Amino acid sequence: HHHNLALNKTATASSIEGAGFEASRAFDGSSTTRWASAEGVDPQWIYVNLGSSQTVNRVKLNWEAAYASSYTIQVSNDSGTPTNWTTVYTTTTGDGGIDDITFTARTAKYVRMHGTVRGTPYGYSLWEFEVYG
């Protein structure tokens, strides 16, 4: 059925704004909660542990106002903490809102949004981050 493989999975971020903006909130299946990073500092990132190696070919991002204009989507099939990342998508012209990206299929345990340039003077923040295969 090609469901969202990332729903309810454990997430990790480079920073969070505070309590209530945990990385997990991008993976809870709701646009009423969001991850938000610390503000004012580049880069920031968030990744999900899919639990196991899975086929992945698509990522959907639902940005809050604090979107990334430069970011990559990256995957890792390391078993432990991910250190070996392959970029599958790059932009320097992100525009926020919904971003939905399809790529040639990979096997990944971890899927990351790594952001380097912000569209606002604040941080990086995602309502939702979905992963499909």
Automatic annotation (TrEMBL):
**Which residue ranges run through the membrane?**
none
The F5/8 type C domain, residue ranges: 4-133
Q: Which family does it belong to?
A: Belongs to the glycosyl hydrolase 8 (cellulase D) family.
The protein's name is Glucanase
Q: Which organism is it from?
A: Paenibacillus fukuinensis
